[PDB]
Each structure stands twice: as C-alpha cells, then as structure tokens.
C-alpha cells in the first residue's frame, strides 16, 4: 500500500470494484502551493518530504465561482466542486489496477469548465472503473482556473498567463518522473479531456514543452480553435486592468498591480472576475489561455495551419446537442422546466445574447443560414435552431476543422459523433444529447449495474471504454472481438466519422457540412 515516489512515499487505499480491487492514490501534491508570493506565477517544484504522505482522500479544489443558477438541481450541481475550495489545490490522483501492473498504459484526464471552473474529484471523473476493467492507470490533476489560473501580463513572470496550463504540464511531468514506480509506462501516456479540458489537450499538442510528456491525445467536445478557447492579448490586458481598477489595485508600475492583487482575498478576486467584460455570454471565458510566448509561442490557428504540432494519433468527437445546455443560462424564453418553444423575436434576441459584439448583418446572416426550414410550421423550429447555432459555432465546427487540419499532416485521426441521451439525465428531453454527458459513458459508470442505467447503456459504455483504451494502448480505437463496426480514419477528403449510440453504430461522412461552411469560411469575416 506504499509507493516510493521521487519526492517521498505515499500511502494509498484499496477499492473493491466489480468483484476486484483498484488501488487509489487520491490527492498527491505535484507542486508548491501557489500561495502568497507565488500566486499568479508558474507552479514551482515540490521539495522532498520524509514521512508517508497519506493520499487517501481527494484534495482541495482550486478557487472558483460556483454555478448557483439551479440550487438543489443535480443537472447543474454535479459539476460544482465536491471538495473544499482553496488556493492550495495543486494535487493529482492515481488509480492503478490490482494486482499492480507491470508496464501499464497511462490515461491522464484534464477536466473542463470554461477554464473558470472544474475539479478532478467529480464523481463522473472517477478513474477506478477504467483501471479495473481495462487495467490502464488513470491520472487526473487539479489546475488553477479563472484569474488565479490565467491572468495575463504578457512577459511579466509575476503574471505571465497560462499558469493553469503549466499546472497541467507539471502534472504530466510528474507522471513522467514517477509513474513507473506505480507500474505505469511513461512511454504510453494518453491525455484525454472534455470541453475546456479538450482544448487544453489540444494546446499540449502545440506546446513544445509538452511534446515529450505524452504519446497520444483524445479531444472530447473541445479544441483550441474554438471561439471561446484563446483570449487575445488585447482583451487579456483590458481584462487584467479592469480587474485592477475593480479592486483598487490600479497602478502604473504593472508589477505593483500584481503585488496589490496578491493581498486581496481569493473571494474578492472571484467576485470581480464576472465584470471584467462589459457583455458576457453563457460561454464567457473571462480568463483563459493566451499567447504567452512561453507555453504558446504564436497564435494557435497559425501553428495548426502550418503543421507546427506533435505528430501522433488523435481521437476527436462531439455530442449531438452541444449547444442546448447554454440556452437556459441566459437566452429569453428558455427554461429547463418547460419545453422552451420560443418565437422568431426570442430567437433574434437570443443571438444578441450569444453574439453581443457582432454586427446586425452578422446576426442576420446567422438567422438566414439557420431559418430556412424543412417545414416551417413546427413550433420547435426556433428552439432547435438556436441550440444548433450555439453548438455548431462553439464546438462541432471547430472540432471538425481541427481534425481536418491536423490530419492533413499525415497522422491518423478518428472522429466520433456521440448521440445517446442518458436514461438518468436530469435535464429535460428537449435538451437532447447535452454537453458533457458523454463523460460518464467514457469513465464506465454504466458498467456499475447498481445505479440505474439500462442494459443498452452498459453495452455502449463497455464498448466506448474498450475503444478508448485500445486507442491509448495501441493508437487504434477498434473493438476487435464482438462483431463491431470498424472505425475508419478521418481523412480531409472523405471525412468519415463514427456514430456512438445504443442502437445502430454507423459510418457517416461530412458531419454538419452545410452549417460548418458558414461558420468556418463565411462567418469569421463578419
Ligand atoms: C497516515 O495513516 C496512518 C495509518 O492509517 C490508518 O491506518 C491504516 C491501516 C488504515 O486503517 C487507515 O484507514 C487509517 O486511517 C496513520 O497512523 C496511525 O497513527 C495514529 C495516530 O493517532 C496511531 O495512534 C495509530 O496507532 C497508527 N496506526 C493505525 C493502524 O492507526 C497516520 O497517523 C497518518 N498520518 C497523518 C499525518 O495523518
Ligand atoms: C475595455 O475596458 C473598458 C473599461 O470598462 C469597464 O470597467 C470595468 C471595470 C467593468 O466594470 C466593465 O463592465 C466596464 O464597462 C470597457 O469600457 C466601457 O464600455 C462600456 C460599454 O461597452 C461602457 O458602458 C463604459 O462606460 C465604458 N467605460 C470606459 C471607461 O470606457 C471597454 O468596452 C473594454 N473593451 C472592449 C473591447 O470591450
Ligand atoms: C418557459 O419558462 C420561461 C421562464 O419563465 C420562468 O420559468 C417558468 C418555468 C415559470 O415559473 C415562470 O414564472 C418564470 O418566469 C418563460 O419565460 C417568461 O415568459 C413570459 C411570457 O412569455 C415573459 O414575461 C418573461 O419575461 C419570461 N421570462 C424569462 C426569464 O424569459 C416562457 O414563457 C416559458 N415558455 C413556455 C412555452 O412555457
Ligand atoms: O463552463 C462554463 N463556461 C464555458 C463552457 C464551455 C465553453 C466555453 C465556456 O461555465 C460553467 C459555470 C457557469 C454555468 N455553466 C453551464 C454550462 C454547462 C454545460 C454542461 C453542463 C453544465 C453546464 C452549466 C458551466
Ligand atoms: C515498458 O515498455 C517500454 C516500451 O514501450 C512501448 O512503446 C510505447 C510507444 C507504448 O505503445 C507501449 O505499449 C510499449 O510497451 C520499454 O522500453 C520499457 O523497458 C518497458 N519497461 C518495463 C518495466 O516493462
Ligand atoms: C516596477 O516595480 C518593480 C518592483 O519593485 C521594480 O523592480 C521595477 O524596477 C519597477 N519599474 C518601474 C518602471 O517603475
Ligand atoms: C462482448 O460481449 C460479451 C457478451 O457476453 C460481453 O461480456 C463483453 O464485455 C463484450 N466486450 C466488449 C469489449 O464489448
């Protein structure tokens, strides 16, 4: 139950899973707590300890604003931190199979949450099912989010930006130096993540300091080229200064602004993050990745376009209804508690909420592309169009474009289209196959026959788990035994992708081709 790591010994705990055993190491620190002088700076190396570190419970989650929009509602509160918030949050978790493996492929999870929220201790990120069922080792880490993680004064090591990305990177580094002691193969490391985590994974494909820290990559519902994923240097500065004046920390020296921001309490910095932008959206990322010239050497669209990234296999995909969850966080006429049949003027009003700084002509162009109906008497027409607008613009089309352009440089790519709505899903049926609700299938929670999934869901989760682990171990997301559809590689010409569902798993081509031509060629110009 004790493992000697390069900075000290850690005690784990035993878990009984599906009539077996998994060894969990919860809450191992991987960096100096970024407190006091260290707030806003890159993570610093952790010095040795002599005792046994008791890694027997999830550590603190990083400071963050909570989603309070639906108190008592499991659909929202399942994403809120299930652990004490604190600035002292740089910890990671390790699940290893029992008995101890000899050279196990490692899966590293990076959670999302708009780069402002999230925590590896969530129930839907529990890595014990994967370790039990597929004998991979699962690693997950907490990284700084919001201004405490991504405040940018470009060039200034007091607040250089991308700290949360560097938190992740130091964690990857920790797996490089230590995972063999747990029986993992540091040469067989697959990053996977969802939404902002997925975008984080894609930026590690771009960052040279990460190229030697992982083998392969899996991108669930996110990528760096998404419109929400990279903050400009203009707006980062404007946001850093609006935070300064909002707290009385306006100075001229710039480094003395950071020193001033370092003596505010975490709460005061969190309360003011909301207002650093004049007009926010349900997809706002007040403080996110920037081109810091350190983690990220150039604007990522250029690096993607010009082949500047780690050459390796990727697994990419999206969910059928990425956009719906955001509609009841601001769009008029929408509610999780009715069927949100909205009118044309409500739709038009919704676009003003999702596209605030966009010209009247840009908003008309969106209306025009999404409102020539196959049948113009359906009352749901505007309700579904707005969800598709948000999903296509923010998730599906950028993921497709990332995959096309990444595969143009000769690496195998696999694209999925997840379209199963979970039987237990707390949100209403009109929200469909929502953002983030493939995650529990990936982590194998339906394999738990107790907690209420249908048997079809167990089968779907069991195949996805196999496909993910085969992708991590061997670079190829096939299920070779049960007579399963082969998953073809995604090539920029055919654009074949795989649908995942409980009924018929099928090979399809050119997902949302009409919508994505509008978003990826036309709309970037308006
Ligand atoms: C770190 O853990 C050790 C041991 O953990 C406990 O013992 C395991 C066998 C398991 O049953 C866990 O769930 C337990 O929580 C701690 O050790 C003991 O320390 C107490 C001090 O009050 C001592 O009285 C006991 O005799 C020790 N042994 C046992 C078996 O309880 C140790 O204190 C922990 N370290 C820290 C810093 O909390
Ligand atoms: C760049 O920042 C200025 C400053 O902004 C404001 O102050 C912050 C502390 C915060 O409370 C924001 O909500 C404020 O708006 C932005 O300027 C203002 O713009 C709004 C409407 O656009 C206007 O009502 C304010 O009076 C303006 N204030 C000033 C001092 O100019 C500006 O919009 C930001 N740039 C961009 C591109 O959004
Ligand atoms: C669906 O509900 C929205 C939200 O209204 C709220 O939630 C409801 C479940 C109910 O408890 C209401 O009392 C709440 O106000 C409805 O939107 C409101 O619609 C009215 C009339 O159209 C309008 O005056 C309000 O401004 C709207 N409020 C918001 C926040 O948008 C909507 O009409 C409902 N639609 C259907 C088809 O039932
Ligand atoms: O993540 C975000 N922003 C965000 C997400 C993706 C891309 C860009 C920005 O903010 C958090 C906190 C505020 C509430 N939102 C909603 C959105 C959503 C989506 C799926 C499940 C639950 C929820 C709650 C989550
Ligand atoms: C562990 O294995 C190492 C080689 O790793 C392999 O190649 C990578 C790319 C993965 O795909 C993985 O499946 C392969 O096993 C050896 O160099 C190393 O010596 C081995 N060590 C032990 C202790 O088994
Ligand atoms: C800004 O303040 C820092 C911190 O004391 C100092 O080292 C630096 O020289 C100052 N620069 C200017 C231009 O005032
Ligand atoms: C294949 O089908 C059998 C049904 O007996 C099931 O037990 C097994 O888990 C399935 N394997 C995969 C990888 O889906």
């Amino acid at each position: 139950i004790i493992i000697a790591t390069k900075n000290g010994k850690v005690r784990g705990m035993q878990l009984t899973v599906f009539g077996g055993t998994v060894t969990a190491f919860l809450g191992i620190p991987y960096a100096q707590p970024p407190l006091g002088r260290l707030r806003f700076k890159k993570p610093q190396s952790l010095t040795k300890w002599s005792d046994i570190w008791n890694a027997t419970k999830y550590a603190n989650s990083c400071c963050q604003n909570i989603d309070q929009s639906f108190p008592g509602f499991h659909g929202s509160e399942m994403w809120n931190p299930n652990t004490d918030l604190s600035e002292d949050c740089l910890y990671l978790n390790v699940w290893i199979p029992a008995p101890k493996p000899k050279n196990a492929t490692v899966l590293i999870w990076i959670y999302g949450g708009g780069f402002q929220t999230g925590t590896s201790s969530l129930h839907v990120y529990d890595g014990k099912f994967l370790a039990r069922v597929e004998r991979v080792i699962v690693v997950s880490m907490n990284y700084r989010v919001g201004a405490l993680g991504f405040l940018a004064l470009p060039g200034n090591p007091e607040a250089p930006g991308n700290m949360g990305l560097f938190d992740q990177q130091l964690a990857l580094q920790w797996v490089q130096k230590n995972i063999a002691a747990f029986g993992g193969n540091p040469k067989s490391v697959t990053l996977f993540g969802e939404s902002a985590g997925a975008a984080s994974v894609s930026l590690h494909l771009l960052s040279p300091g990460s190229h030697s820290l992982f083998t392969r990559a899996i991108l669930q519902s996110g990528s760096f080229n998404a419109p929400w994923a990279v903050t400009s240097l203009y707006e980062a500065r404007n946001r850093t200064l609006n935070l300064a004046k909002l707290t009385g920390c306006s100075r001229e020296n710039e480094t003395e602004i950071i020193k001033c921001l370092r003596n505010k309490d975490p709460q005061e910095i969190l309360l003011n993050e909301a207002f650093v932008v004049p007009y926010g959206t349900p997809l706002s990322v007040n403080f996110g990745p920037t081109v810091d010239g350190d983690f990220l050497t150039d604007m990522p669209d250029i690096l993607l376009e010009l082949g500047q990234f780690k050459k390796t296999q990727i697994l990419v995909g999206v969910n059928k209804d990425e956009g719906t969850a955001f509609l009841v966080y601001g769009a008029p006429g929408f509610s999780k508690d009715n069927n949100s049949i909205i009118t044309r003027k409500e739709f038009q009003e919704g676009l003003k909420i999702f596209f605030p700084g966009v010209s009247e002509f840009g908003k008309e162009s969106i209306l025009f592309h999404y409102t020539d109906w196959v049948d113009d008497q359906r009352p749901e027409n505007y309700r579904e169009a707005l969800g598709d607008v948000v999903g296509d613009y923010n998730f599906i089309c950028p993921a497709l474009e990332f995959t096309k352009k990444f595969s143009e440089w000769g690496n195998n790519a696999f694209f999925y289209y997840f379209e199963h709505r979970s039987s237990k899903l707390p949100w209403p049926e009109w929200m469909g196959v929502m953002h983030g609700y493939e995650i529990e299938f990936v982590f194998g929670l339906p394999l738990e026959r107790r907690d209420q999934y249908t048997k079809a869901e167990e089968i779907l989760s069991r195949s996805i788990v196999k496909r993910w682990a085969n992708f991590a171990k061997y670079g190829n997301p096939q299920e070779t035994q049960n007579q399963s559809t082969s998953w073809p590689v995604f090539k920029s010409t055919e654009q074949k992708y795989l649908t995942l569902n409980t009924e018929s798993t099928r090979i399809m081509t050119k997902l949302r081709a009409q919508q994505c031509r509008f978003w990826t060629s036309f709309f970037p110009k308006v």
Side-chain angles (χ1 to χ4, degrees), residues 313-316 403 406-407 411-415 488-491:
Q313 307 70 52
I314 59 172
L315 201 159
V316 185
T403 310
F406 188 101
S407 77
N411 288 114
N412 283 17
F414 306 86
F415 201 95
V489 306
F490 180 105
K491 289 166 176 128

Side-chain angles (χ1 to χ4, degrees), residues 148-454:
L148 288 163
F150 294 91
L151 175 97
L153 274 201
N156 188 340
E158 303 307 345
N162 292 343
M163 299 82 77
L165 291 163
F166 279 116
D167 293 343
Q168 296 170 21
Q169 199 185 64
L170 198 63
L172 308 192
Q173 181 98 62
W174 179 99
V175 166
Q176 280 307 275
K177 285 142 148 211
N178 294 277
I179 205 60
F182 300 82
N185 183 359
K187 300 188 160 302
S188 191
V189 173
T190 294
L191 310 183
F192 71 136
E194 186 267 358
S195 161
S200 309
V201 158
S202 77
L203 286 171
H204 290 288
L205 288 173
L206 263 48
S207 196
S210 303
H211 286 176
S212 87
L213 300 192
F214 67 105
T215 318
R216 268 184 278 286
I218 304 179
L219 278 65
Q220 299 173 209
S221 288
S223 53
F224 68 76
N225 59 327
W228 50 263
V230 179
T231 313
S232 96
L233 294 214
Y234 169 66
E235 42 197 19
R237 178 151 216 278
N238 217 47
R239 289 168 205 196
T240 288
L241 306 167
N242 293 333
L243 188 70
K245 199 77 72 55
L246 273 162
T247 58
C249 283
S250 284
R251 309 287 187 268
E252 190 264 8
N253 169 280
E254 270 208 5
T255 307
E256 263 162 56
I257 290 176
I258 309 314
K259 193 174 199 121
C260 179
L261 279 161
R262 285 186 181 164
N263 304 133
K264 303 292 170 274
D265 299 335
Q267 265 313 309
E268 175 159 15
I269 278 180
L270 289 175
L271 312 168
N272 286 286
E273 286 176 22
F275 320 105
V276 294
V277 60
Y279 293 122
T281 73
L283 288 114
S284 271
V285 177
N286 301 315
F287 289 95
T290 56
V291 193
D292 66 342
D294 189 358
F295 186 92
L296 189 54
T297 57
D298 201 347
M299 308 198 347
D301 40 304
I302 305 175
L303 305 177
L304 177 54
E305 174 66 30
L306 297 187
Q308 308 301 309
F309 45 84
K310 168 185 192 71
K311 305 291 175 314
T312 186
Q313 307 70 52
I314 59 172
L315 201 159
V316 185
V318 301
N319 296 352
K320 185 179 126 108
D321 292 288
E322 300 282 10
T324 48
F326 304 86
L327 300 180
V328 303
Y329 279 86
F334 278 91
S335 156
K336 84 182 183 64
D337 293 316
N338 62 34
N339 65 358
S340 313
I341 296 293
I342 59 145
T343 60
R344 177 182 175 85
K345 290 64 51 208
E346 293 180 302
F347 177 93
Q348 283 169 322
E349 226 59 54
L351 288 185
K352 186 41 162 142
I353 274 149
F354 282 100
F355 297 88
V358 167
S359 62
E360 283 329 301
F361 166 78
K363 294 196 273 290
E364 267 173 295
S365 91
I366 303 173
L367 180 135
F368 174 78
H369 186 93
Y370 278 90
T371 55
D372 176 37
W373 327 104
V374 314
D375 177 334
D376 40 69
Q377 321 285 320
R378 275 254 302 260
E380 304 81 6
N381 269 341
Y382 291 93
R383 180 196 80 191
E384 324 217 314
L386 193 63
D388 283 323
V389 165
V390 167
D392 296 343
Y393 171 58
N394 280 291
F395 300 103
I396 296 184
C397 295
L400 288 158
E401 180 79 332
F402 173 84
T403 310
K404 288 173 83 296
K405 283 208 276 142
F406 188 101
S407 77
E408 265 152 17
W409 294 86
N411 288 114
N412 283 17
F414 306 86
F415 201 95
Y416 69 83
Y417 186 58
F418 183 86
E419 62 195 10
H420 175 74
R421 181 183 196 272
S422 151
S423 68
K424 314 180 49 183
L425 184 120
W427 302 91
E429 305 114 294
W430 73 259
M431 286 183 142
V433 180
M434 283 170 74
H435 190 68
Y437 283 91
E438 91 289 351
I439 296 170
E440 65 210 72
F441 282 78
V442 170
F443 272 86
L445 273 67
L447 303 183
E448 179 69 89
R449 207 131 51 187
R450 280 142 184 179
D451 215 52
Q452 303 304 100
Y453 293 98
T454 80

Side-chain angles (χ1 to χ4, degrees), residues 78-117:
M78 59 176 295
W79 306 105
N80 292 326
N82 58 346
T83 278
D84 275 299
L85 311 189
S86 154
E87 284 193 279
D88 167 16
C89 63
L90 295 189
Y91 304 77
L92 52 79
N93 318 293
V94 188
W95 290 269
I96 78 167
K100 191 163 174 289
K102 289 207 162 270
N103 221 9
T105 284
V106 184
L107 276 87
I108 301 178
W109 176 251
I110 302 178
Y111 59 72
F115 294 107
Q116 329 291 292
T117 66

Side-chain angles (χ1 to χ4, degrees), residues 459 462-463 466-467 478-486:
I459 295 145
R462 178 69 203 92
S463 176
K466 170 62 64 186
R467 292 194 192 265
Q478 314 303 326
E479 194 295 299
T480 68
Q481 323 183 331
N482 309 5
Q483 312 104 279
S484 293
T485 321
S486 300

